[PDB]
Every structure is written in C-alpha cells, then in structure tokens.
Design a protein around this ligand. Sequence first.
Ligand SMILES: [Ca+2]
Ligand SMILES: [Ca+2]
Ligand SMILES: [Ca+2]
Ligand SMILES: [Ca+2]
Ligand code: NA
Length: 193
Amino acid sequence: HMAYSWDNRVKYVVRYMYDIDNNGYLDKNDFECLALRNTLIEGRGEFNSDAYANNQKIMSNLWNEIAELADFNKDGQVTVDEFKQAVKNLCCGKSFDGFPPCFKTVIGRLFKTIDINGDGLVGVDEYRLDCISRSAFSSVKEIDDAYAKLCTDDDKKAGGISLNRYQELYAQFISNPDEKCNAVYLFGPLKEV
Ligand SMILES: [Ca+2]
Ligand SMILES: [Ca+2]
Ligand SMILES: [Ca+2]
Ligand SMILES: [Ca+2]
Ligand code: NA
C-alpha cells in the first residue's frame, strides 16, 4: 500500500515494534526475544537476571494481552491483518488514553530508549538516531524535513517531543486514515514495508 496509508503504518508498527524475529507474524518467540533485547540494552550488554525476569513478565503479559484481543483464528499467532482488526476495534476513534494497555505500555518503553539524554524530550539528534535504527538514508535533510513536519511550533519551542505528545502522535499514526496528518512522520520518512 501507499507509504503513509493507514495500512502501511500499521504494518510498519507490527514489523518494527513487535516482529523482532522478522518472520512476518507475532508469536511468543517475538516477546521472548524482546525480553532479552530490552534486558541487554538496559544493561549496556550486561545481563542482570532480575531485570531479565522483570522483562520476561512484562513481555509474557503483553503477548497474552495481544493474543486475547487479536488472535481471530485462535492459532497462537497474530498476523498483520489480525493486528489491523484489533487496531480498528480498539484504537480507531479513541485517543491514546482509551487504548487497551497492550497498545499503550509499548510507547513509554520506546520513548525512554529514544530519549538518550533522559531530559523527557525527543529532540532532533535523538530522532535522527531513531530513524537510522530502522532504515537507510542518504540525506540528513530527508530526516530533518520529517521531524519538522511531525513537530508543532509548541514542540519546537519546548526543544522536542514529550512523552504524552509522543503518545498523542502515536495514537494518530496507528488510527488516523489521513495520509497528510503530521503524525505520519512519527518514525521518520516511510516506504512501503
Ligand atoms: Ca515474529
Ligand atoms: Ca492468528
Ligand atoms: Ca532527550
Ligand atoms: Ca536530541
Ligand atoms: Na490489554
């Protein structure tokens, strides 16, 4: 589908936020791998067995929640189309606070990872590093043009995107069908997945 279509945006979220083993669908192995990845990134490569246990619990609960809401054919996997139906059911027409917990809790964690300097704002430097974590770019101006469209004058006055703003933009990213909405740039310039 068109790069900034709702279909491609939801497919992008499934690919990059959840499908860590890159096999095209979600299952328990993705969440096992996310538990380990989060542990090691939190530890700067150190493995803390208590941090790991905490993360394994968070990710097991997350997977149980997503499968409860999205496993339409009861096969223990959640496809892109199943995830899209859960988004239509539970996100479309709602603001972020009305999303189910399994669609909400993921953002706090991504935001904390992006916010390298811990000042509670994602600024342009942090956004550039986020963008190159998923995709290839030749032009820093392409990334910076996306940040400039994404952010409002109040975001720019603040020096970046706060957590509740990041969540507001995410809610529009995953729910608004308008391909021209500023929030379509949340994860950088897009291509078809
Ligand atoms: Ca997978
Ligand atoms: Ca399924
Ligand atoms: Ca920051
Ligand atoms: Ca920054
Ligand atoms: Na939930």
